[PDB]
């Protein structure tokens, strides 16, 4: 028992950390409808059911939600899949004619601006010699003046505008993220998971749990909850440059809609392409709105206050305040409802001061058609109008707040709803997963000999 003989064993269980290109997978729900009738339905493998997950033991692996891979890349995959969906769709290039435009003959007041502008203009039919005159309706955030005030679409000088095909529907669809043969997805099942550092009990899986990408700046809609404690996931909380993710347990039922009745209309732009505009608005004219249940909202904000008071000392004052500037899509949270995007404001919620010791809450919207999402320099897309009344019931699950850079000994640590980019919308979904590279062929000393 003194000689040391080298041996190498294949199949040794031992892994390392690595950066690698993961592998998508689509549920059979998206596959139920085929021939590209929906979004991201024919670009993934069917997901294998009944996985062979084994509850690991006596393993202490560390996570780091902020300095981890598999999250900076899924944004690239999402944006690439999104961009490739507009190549076979119509272009609006010959549309930017001088719109002779007026106000809808509504019973408006002085403050309540006309949110529909009735604009008429010229267009080129199939016969290239003749030009027709057509009329349509635009929202107030799609016309900028030039000089009976001539209007033009805001992003025409900015870049060419692409129209989304009516066949595709923007609704999120569940996705799965499996690893190519060789890797493993370490997920740790700790209850009070800070997110960084060691995590007690782990488990290796081959595919992720149901993940769905939802574009929403503040108050991420339709998300995944926490287990027992309303969690505040930003270890580095003292520095005020980084946002603070909050995930509270019981969901808040955000119930919104638009009650107008749009009438879709078709115009001929050329031999093969059609321009889908808004016809005549029938019925009543109102303002699209959202409701949140007051008791649930107040109780949830109380819980958030309780859990935030632990990271700043017991005796301190906390007061919220609405967003204080920025673009129209981070000043107030943006969400897609029914295939169209509401820029509905959120100053009726983040207004509560909590010293140390049901009437539905309504909040008004404004609707935009042409969008510049992800702030691509030169891509503006047009959202065709959706016919009728539109509605959606959603699950508010978290917050995205930013502290105030208070000097001296700021006690009333005011927070703001800080939307940031769309990456924090996903970082709360992929905090429990790390991608490990299996490294077989371990080396070990023992006693043996290969005789002859």
């Amino acid at each position, epitope marked *: 028992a003194e000689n040391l003989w080298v041996t190498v064993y294949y199949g040794v269980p031992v892994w390392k950390d690595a950066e690698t290109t993961l592998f998508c997978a689509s549920d059979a729900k998206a596959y139920e409808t085929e021939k590209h009738n929906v979004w991201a339905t024919h670009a993934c493998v069917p997901t294998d059911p009944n996985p062979q997950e084994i509850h690991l033991e006596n393993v202490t692996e560390e996570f780091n939600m902020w300095k981890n891979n598999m999250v900076e890349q899924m944004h690239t995959d999402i944006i690439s899949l999104w961009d490739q969906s507009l190549k076979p769709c119509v272009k609006l290039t010959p549309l930017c004619v001088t719109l002779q435009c007026t106000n809808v003959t509504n019973n408006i007041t002085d403050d309540m601006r006309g949110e529909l502008k009735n604009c008429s203009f010229n267009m080129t039919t199939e016969l290239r010699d003749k030009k027709q005159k057509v009329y349509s309706l635009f929202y107030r955030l799609d016309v900028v003046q030039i000089n009976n005030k001539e209007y033009r679409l805001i992003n025409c000088n900015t870049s060419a505008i692409t129209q989304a095909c009516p066949k595709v529907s923007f609704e999120p669809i569940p996705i799965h993220y499996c690893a190519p043969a060789g890797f493993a997805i370490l997920k740790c099942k700790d209850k009070k998971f800070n997110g960084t550092g060691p995590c007690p009990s782990v488990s290796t899986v081959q595919c992720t749990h149901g993940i769905k990408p939802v574009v929403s700046t503040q108050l991420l809609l339709n998300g995944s909850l926490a287990e027992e404690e309303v969690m505040i996931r930003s270890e580095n909380i003292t520095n005020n440059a980084k946002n603070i993710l909050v995930q509270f347990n019981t969901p808040v039922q955000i119930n919104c809609t638009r009650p107008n009745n749009n009438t879709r209309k078709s115009i001929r732009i050329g031999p093969g392409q059609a321009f889908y505009a808004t016809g005549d608005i029938i019925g009543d004219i109102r303002q699209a709105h959202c409701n949140v249940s007051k008791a649930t909202w107040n109780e949830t904000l109380g819980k958030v206050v309780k859990q935030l008071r632990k990271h700043f000392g017991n005796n301190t004052i906390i007061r919220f305040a609405n967003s*204080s500037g920025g673009d129209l899509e981070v000043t107030t949270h943006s969400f897609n409802c029914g295939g169209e995007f509401f820029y509905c404001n959120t100053s009726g919620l983040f207004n509560s001061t909590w010293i140390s010791n049901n009437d539905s809450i309504t909040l008004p919207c404004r609707i935009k058609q042409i969008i510049n999402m992800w702030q691509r320099i030169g891509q503006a897309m047009y959202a065709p109008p959706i016919q009728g009344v539109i509605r959606c019931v959603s699950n508010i699950t978290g917050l995205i707040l930013t502290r105030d*850079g*208070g000097s001296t000994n700021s006690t009333t640590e005011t927070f703001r709803p800080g939307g940031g980019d769309m990456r924090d919308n996903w970082r709360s979904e992929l905090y429990k997963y790390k991608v490990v590279k299996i490294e077989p062929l371990g080396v070990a000393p023992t006693r043996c000999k290969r005789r002859v």
Partner: antibody
Amino acid sequence: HVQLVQSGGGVKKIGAAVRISCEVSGYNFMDQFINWVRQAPGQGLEWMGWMNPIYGQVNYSWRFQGRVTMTRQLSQDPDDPDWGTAFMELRGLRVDDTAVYYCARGPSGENYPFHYWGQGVRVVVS
Amino acid sequence: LTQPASMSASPGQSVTISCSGTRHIISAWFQQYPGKPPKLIIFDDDKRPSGVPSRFSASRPGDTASLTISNVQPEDEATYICNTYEFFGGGTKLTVLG
């Protein structure tokens, strides 16, 4: 390199709006929050907030809320996508803020602490 | 953050500057010429940028940040700024006699 310049100081009568421009190039402008630091003669530095040019995010101090606007302008054409201009409009200033304003920034990937600083626009009130 | 107003020194002397408070959240040291943009000279209490003489060193056993300098060069009179993330210290005027 890391090119950053300022413009638009001077002396103004009380009750008017001071515009201060900070123009930056030499690096991708999407990241690297602008931090607006004011330096009052006879005292150490004080901080009056910061701005983020991805979506014009702002984050003020406990004193300037309701008196400052930290606006931005990106580059419209993809010819030069890294030419940014952060504007700060200060309104209704009291007589006691004759100072020098710098538009600092931070390292690659973070925001604290400031490395690069600006020559600094000096503003006086009469 | 209650820094000393000013201090004097002579060439060849080593002096220590103490910053109070900072509640153990990592401080930084800025060197400033009068009417100029200070550039970072100490960050993370353990590193210095390229182009800085090695006579500068900093540490923080507790709340106070201690920055010690040796063999101070006669033309290194300046002002010193203490940084604690968002705040800024009181600064000090270091004058080297000749």
